[PDB]
């Protein structure tokens, strides 16, 4: 029996990691992720400079998930690079860093700085093209021309295998158009589906007021809200992008939901909202639960069922 | 108290079915008319009868619904006859949803509707957001295609109508959509929103998708879509001040209808909850919305419509 995953020139102990932005901003966040049972971890979407973010309250927990408009609060790219260079214990697990320039030029500058550290330590890049929460900066992945520009220039500047955090799509034509762009770039080795459902609105009936301050209450949705959307996107790209891996992100609170992500095509499985609710102890539970479901169904490895979701067509 | 006075009509309350739920057959429409609902709307129809997609094509879920019906309907002639000859307009006003799979089909259909709207007052909701027909993507996600539909239908129908919009998730798309809509004055109402398109639900017991069409991909409704619906309602409420907004998505109770109205909704549509519960839900919804209004001291809907507070 094995929850192991062998991809991207690394052996992962299990397919679980945090979703970018959850429990990965500070050194202590990252130390707690490394101490956890997670197979990996990813740093907060960083910017070239430290960034303070949107006004609070900017996160609100809901019965069916979460809404956030954090606005990319982070320590700046140099902090994450130094963590990856010196601090992170790579004998424990591999490390991803998320990078989210608000422009091509900023993302290019950060990925240039990452190059020697990836060469030195094997630090993996996830490029965020789906932040829904910075006022005036719409999700890059919803503009295919802009997406193409990012992928070209980052491919050129970084020159190493990297991944992309995609926004959810809801239109078959858009799965097709997105895949075509992505398939034009061989250094994109993984596709993370998905970021939050952008620009939802939650209102408190008692005070008749939105629950978050930024953008008149409009925020990204995660948790139970996004599971069917996340699975559709993982499978859509799994089917269209034959020479890329897909990482599943959205709605994972258990081994059984992790199992569904893997069935849909997911290599790794990212946990956001549930981890925010529960803390890093969640990873021990998730391993146990996924192992148990496999045992019940007679599966011994993840690749015995990855992408094996059954259709009736 | 719950009354709504819009579009040349008085409605007893803001509630109606969502297009496609309990509104395909004459018996469906009879039961909607007999219900406590303020209005009702016909199934999105096509010029010819449609059998729709293979089964299973609806699956009910703890947090809502997934569907890929494929516009199964009795054909435009039936809905037009229902509107001209059968429907009791003393009970409540009637909407018809039209969902031509091309502009040419939509133009043909709305032309037939003209005399019936003039004589009986039947209201058009033009469906621009079906996510369930293969090779025919949501028109509302292409602002060029959307402008052409709106132009040719404006010319062909020439009377006040509304549009069923897909949900948008990008402020840039709120801005673009509203700008396209604001170029057509005959568009008097905007229904936000249609199902969240092309989600995928898989049963872990059998490792199998739950609906047959399109490898399991269908539209999501119910509890999944409430924040998306509320956001879309309010986005268009703010961007289209000379139009009305209908709310649709995630309404299972008076509290959720209150939120839709607070976000900007004039009428409130009920899909999934109604599929679950049946037309008796409308009597519950009227009672719950009243209870919330009395607790807050509102005597009318316009005392709070669109008055959601923000902190910025
Ligand atoms: C508090 C908060 C902060 C987040 N920050 C980031 C971010 O830095 N970069 C990113 O790609 N996604 C970010 N996300 C989105 C998550 O990575 C994930 O895509 C989303 O929450 C869906 O997963 P979930 O259902 O497990 O929450 C954030 C989510 C939340 C809840
Ligand atoms: C069974 C099914 C059939 C539907 N058919 C139509 C349709 O004919 N036309 C339309 O505009 N919307 C149709 N819808 C979408 C609903 O009208 C509504 O926009 C969506 O389900 C979200 O509302 P809800 O959360 O109350 O279900 C259908 C939905 C379902 C559940
Ligand atoms: O920092 C954030 O606001 C943030 C970034 C992102 O990519 N996704 C998200 O939900 N929030
Ligand atoms: O008939 C359908 O499949 C259908 C049409 C529509 O507009 N929305 C929906 O959810 N289903
Ligand atoms: Br914007
Ligand atoms: Br579609
Ligand atoms: Br089991
Ligand atoms: Br009017
Ligand atoms: Br299509
Ligand atoms: Br959108």
Residues of chain B with CATH 3.20.20.70: 1-52+71-195+222-312
Mark out the alpha helices in chain A (DSSP H runs).
27-35, 77-82, 104-121, 144-158, 172-183, 227-240, 255-264, 273-278, 282-297
Please check whether the domain covering B53-70+196-221 is classified as CATH 2.30.26.10: yes
Of A304, A262, A283, nearest to A1 by C-alpha is A304
Residues after which chain B is discontinuous, using a C–N cutoff of 2.5 Å: none
List the structure tokens of A65. Answer: 């998930």
d(CA A21, CA A36): 16
Residue B254 zone, left/alpha/beta (φ > 0; ψ -120 to 50; rest): alpha
Cβ–Cβ of A200/B66 closer than 8 Å? Answer: no
Which resolution in angstroms does this entry have? 2.0
DSSP letter for A87, please: I
Q: b or e along B245-260 (b: 16 or more beta carbons within 10 Å of the residue's beta carbon)?
A: bbbbbbbbbbebbbbb
CB of A130 shorter than 6 A to ligand 3:
yes
Phi, psi of B45 (to 5 degrees): -110, 165
What distance, in Å, lies between the first and last C-alpha atoms of chain A?
Answer: 32
In whole angstroms, what is the distance from residue A166 CA to residue B309 CA? 32
The residue whose CA has the least distance to atom 26 of ligand 1 is A272
Q: List, in order, residues 6 or more apart from B177 with CB less than 8 Å away.
A: B140, B143, B146, B165, B168, B236
Question: Which B residues 80-109 touch A at CB under 8 Å?
Answer: none
Helix (H) or strand (E) holding B246: strand B244-248
- Listed by number, the residues of chain A in 162-191 with a beta carbon closer than 8 Å to a beta carbon of chain B are 167-175
Answer whether A200 sits within 8 Å of B228, measured CB to CB.
yes
Nearest to B228 by CA among B259, B205, B274, B189: B259
Cα A180 from chain centroid?
21
Q: Among all residues of B, which ones are annotated catalytic?
A: 130
Q: How far apart are CA A39 and CA B127, in angstroms?
A: 46
A contacts of B227 (beta carbons < 8 Å): 67, 200-202, 221, 225
Q: Which residue has the tokens 């690394």?
A: A10
CA distances from residue A163 to A110, B171, B305 in whole angstroms, order as listed: 15, 25, 45
Q: What is the DSSP string of B116-131?
A: HHHHH-PEEEEE----
Orientation of helix B143-157 relative to helix B103-120, angle to 10°: 40
- How close is the Cα of B178 to the center of ligand 5, in Å? 13
Residue from A173, A243, A245, A280 nearest A12 by CA: A245
Which residue in this structure is represented by tokens 């520009």? A149
- State whether residue A272 sits within 8 Å of chain B by CB: no
CA–centroid distance, B132 to ligand 6, in Å, is 6
The CATH code that applies to domain B1-52+71-195+222-312 is: 3.20.20.70
- Top CATH class of A1-53+72-196+223-313 equals alpha beta
Pairing of β A124-128 and β A162-165: parallel
Distances in Å between the Cα of B142 and the Cα atoms of A172, B129, B148, B233, B271 are 13, 10, 10, 20, 25
SS3 (DSSP) at B210: coil
Expressed in angstroms and rounded, the spacing between residue A192 Cα and the centre of ligand 4 is 28
Tell me whether strands A245-249 and B64-67 are parallel, antiparallel or unpaired.
unpaired
Dihedral of alpha carbons B125, B145, B166, A266, sign: positive
Enter the DSSP assignment of A127.
E
Please count the residues of chain A: 313
H or E segment at B17? strand B15-17
CA gyration radius, chain B: 18
First to last CA, chain B: 32
CA angle B127, B129, B131 (to 5 degrees): 130
Q: Is B109 helix (H, G, I), strand (E, B) or coil?
A: helix
Q: How far is the CA of B136 from the centre of ligand 6 (A)?
A: 7
**Hey, which residues does A75 pair with through a beta bridge?**
none
Q: Judge: A217–B310 Cβ closer than 8 Å, yes or no.
A: yes
Cβ of A172 and B217 within 8 Å?
yes
**Best CA proximity match to B260, nearest among B295, B299, B211, B225:** B225
Which residue carries 């309602």 as its tokens? B233
Lining ligand 1 with CB less than 6 A are A 19-22, 44-45, 59, 66, 68, 70, 98, 128, 165, 195-196, 222-223, 226, 249-252, 271-274, 276
- Beta carbon pairs, A and B, within 8 Å: 168
| Burial of residue A1, with CB atoms counted within 10 A of its CB: 0-12 exposed, 13-18 middle, 19 or more buried | exposed
Tokens 């059968």 — which residue?
B86
Q: What is the DSSP letter of A103?
A: S
**Closest atom, ligand 3, to C-alpha of A195:** 8
What is the maximal distance between C-alpha atoms in chain B? 55
Round to whole Å and give the CA distance between B207 and A293.
12
* Phi, then psi, of B245 in degrees rounded to 5: -120, 130
Distance (Å, whole) CA A90 – CA A151:
28
Contact B217, B67 (CB under 8 A): no
User: Are A210 and A217 contacting, i.e. CB atoms less than 8 angstroms apart?
Assistant: yes
Contact B232, B165 (CB under 8 A): yes
CB B293 within 8 A of CB B299: yes
SS3 B77: helix
Element (H, E) at B189: strand B187-192
CB A253 within 8 A of CB A219: no
B310–A209: do the CB atoms touch at under 8 Å?
Answer: yes
Spatial separation of the C-alpha atoms in residues A101 and B254, rounded to whole Å: 43
**Do residues B79 and B45 lie in contact, with contact meaning Cβ atoms separated by under 8 Å?**
yes
Going along chain A, which residue ranges are E strands? Answer: 5-7, 10-12, 16-18, 41-46, 59-62, 65-68, 95-99, 124-128, 162-165, 188-193, 197-201, 203-204, 209-210, 218-223, 245-249, 266-271
Query: What string of DSSP letters covers A254-275?
Result: SHHHHHHHHHHTEEEEEE-HHH
Instruction: From A190, A229, A287, A133, select the one nearest B131 (Cα to Cα).
Output: A229
Question: Relative to the CA of A21, which ligand 1 atom is closest?
Answer: 5
Chain B hits for A194, CB-CB cut-off 8 Å, are: none
Pairing of strands B58-61, B40-45: unpaired
**Using a CB-CB distance cutoff of 8 angstroms, which residues of chain A are in contact with residue B169?**
132, 139, 142, 167-168, 170, 197-199
Q: Cα–Cα distance between A172 and B214 in angstroms, integer?
A: 10
DSSP one-letter code for A85: I
Q: Which residues of B touch A214 (CB under 8 A)?
A: 312
A66 phi and psi angles, rounded to 5 deg: -155, 155
Distance B184 CA to ligand 10 centre (A): 21
Measured between alpha carbons, how far is B7 from B244 in angstroms, rounded to an integer?
9
CA dihedral A294, A296, A297, A302 (to 10 degrees): 0
Q: Is the CB of B50 under 6 A from ligand 2?
A: no
- What residue's CA is closest to ligand 3, atom 7? A131
Nearest partner of B24 among B95, B74, B59, B86, judged by Cα: B74
CA distance A260 to chain B (A): 7
DSSP β-ladder status, A65-68 and B161-165: unpaired
Tell me the longest C-alpha to C-alpha distance in chain A. 55
**Hey, is B163 helix, strand or coil?**
strand
Q: Coil, strand or helix: which one is A161?
A: coil
- Pairing relation of β-strands A10-12 and A5-7? antiparallel
Please, is B239 exposed, middle or buried when counting C-beta atoms within 10 Å of its C-beta (0-12, 13-18, 19+)? middle
Cα separation, B153 vs B108, in Å, equals 9
Choose among A151, A228, A174: nearest CA to A197.
Answer: A228
Measuring CA to CA, which residue among A304, A302, A225, A305 is closest to residue A14? Answer: A302
Q: Show the tokens assigned to A98.
A: 């998320």
* The token pair that represents A12 in the structure block: 């992962």
CB B63 within 8 A of CB A224: yes
Measured from the Cα of A131, ligand 3's closest atom is: 7
Residues 6+ apart with CB under 8 A from B162: B95, B123, B124, B125, B126, B187, B188, B189, B190, B191, B244, B246
Phi, psi of A141 (to 5 degrees): -60, -15
Assigned token pair, B39: 């209005």
- Cα separation, A17 vs B273, in Å, equals 36
Q: CB atoms < 10 A from the CB of A240, how many? A: 17
H or E segment to which residue B181 belongs? helix B171-181
Give the method used. Answer: X-ray
The distance of B175 to chain A (nearest Cα, Å) reads 12
Q: How far is A184 from chain B (nearest CA, A)?
A: 23
CA-nearest of A294, A219, A285, A229 to A253 is A285
Residue among A20, A21, A14 at smallest CA distance from A36: A14
Q: What's the CA gap between A56 and A37, in Å, rounded? A: 31
| CATH topology assigned to domain A54-71+197-222 | Dihydroorotate Dehydrogenase A; chain A, domain 2 (2.30.26)
Asked if residue A194 has a cis previous peptide bond (ω within 30° of 0), the answer is yes
Q: Six-digit token pair at B223?
A: 């509890």
Q: Do residue A138 and residue B208 have CB atoms under 8 angstroms apart?
A: no
Per DSSP, what are the bridge partners of residue B11? B4
Q: Using CA atoms, how far apart are residues B15 and B95, in angstroms rounded to an integer?
A: 13
Chain B residues with CB inside 8 Å of A232's CB?
198-200, 217
Domain with CATH 2.30.26.10 in chain B: 53-70+196-221
CA atoms A119, A122, A123, A129: torsion sign:
positive
CA dihedral angle for residue B22, residue A197, residue A23, residue A153, rounded to 10 degrees? 160
d(CA B126, CA B150): 9
**A205 — contact with chain B (CB < 8 Å)?**
yes
Residue range(s) of every CATH 3.20.20.70 domain in chain A? 1-53+72-196+223-313
Residue with tokens 């009736």: A312
CB B268 within 8 A of CB B15: yes
The size of chain B, in residues, is 312
């Amino acid at each position: 029996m094995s929850l192991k995953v062998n991809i991207l020139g690394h052996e992962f102990s299990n397919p679980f990691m945090n979703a970018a932005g959850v429990l990965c901003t500070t050194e202590e966040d990252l130390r707690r992720m490394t101490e956890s049972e997670s197979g990996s971890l990813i740093g907060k979407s960083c910017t070239l400079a430290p960034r303070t973010g949107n006004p609070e309250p900017r996160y609100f927990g809901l019965p069916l998930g979460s809404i956030n408009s954090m606005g990319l609060p982070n320590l700046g790219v140099d902090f994450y690079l130094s963590y990856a260079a010196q601090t992170h214990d790579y004998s424990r697990k591999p490390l991803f860093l998320s990078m989210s320039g608000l422009s091509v030029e900023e993302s290019v500058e950060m990925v240039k700085k990452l190059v020697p550290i990836t060469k030195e330590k094997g630090t993996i890049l996830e490029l965020n093209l789906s932040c829904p929460n910075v006022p005036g900066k719409p999700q890059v992945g919803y503009d295919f021309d802009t997406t193409r520009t990012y992928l070209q220039k980052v491919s050129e500047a970084y020159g190493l295998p990297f991944g992309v955090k995609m926004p959810p799509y809801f239109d078959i034509a858009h799965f097709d158009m997105a895949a075509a762009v992505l398939n034009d770039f061989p250094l994109v080795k993984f596709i993370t589906c998905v970021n939050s459902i952008g620009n939802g609105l939650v209102i408190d009936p008692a005070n008749e007021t939105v629950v978050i301050k930024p953008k008149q209450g409009f925020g990204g949705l995660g948790g139970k809200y996004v599971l069917p959307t996340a699975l559709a996107n993982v499978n859509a790209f799994f089917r269209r992008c034959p020479d890329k891996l897909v990482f599943g992100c959205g709605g994972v609170y258990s081994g059984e939901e992790a199992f569904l992500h893997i069935l849909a095509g997911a290599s790794m499985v990212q946990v956001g909202t549930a981890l925010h609710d529960e803390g890093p102890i969640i990873f021990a539970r998730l391993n146990k639960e996924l192992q148990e479901i496999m045992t019940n169904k007679g599966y011994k490895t993840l690749d015995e069922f990855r992408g094996r979701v059954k259709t009736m067509d």
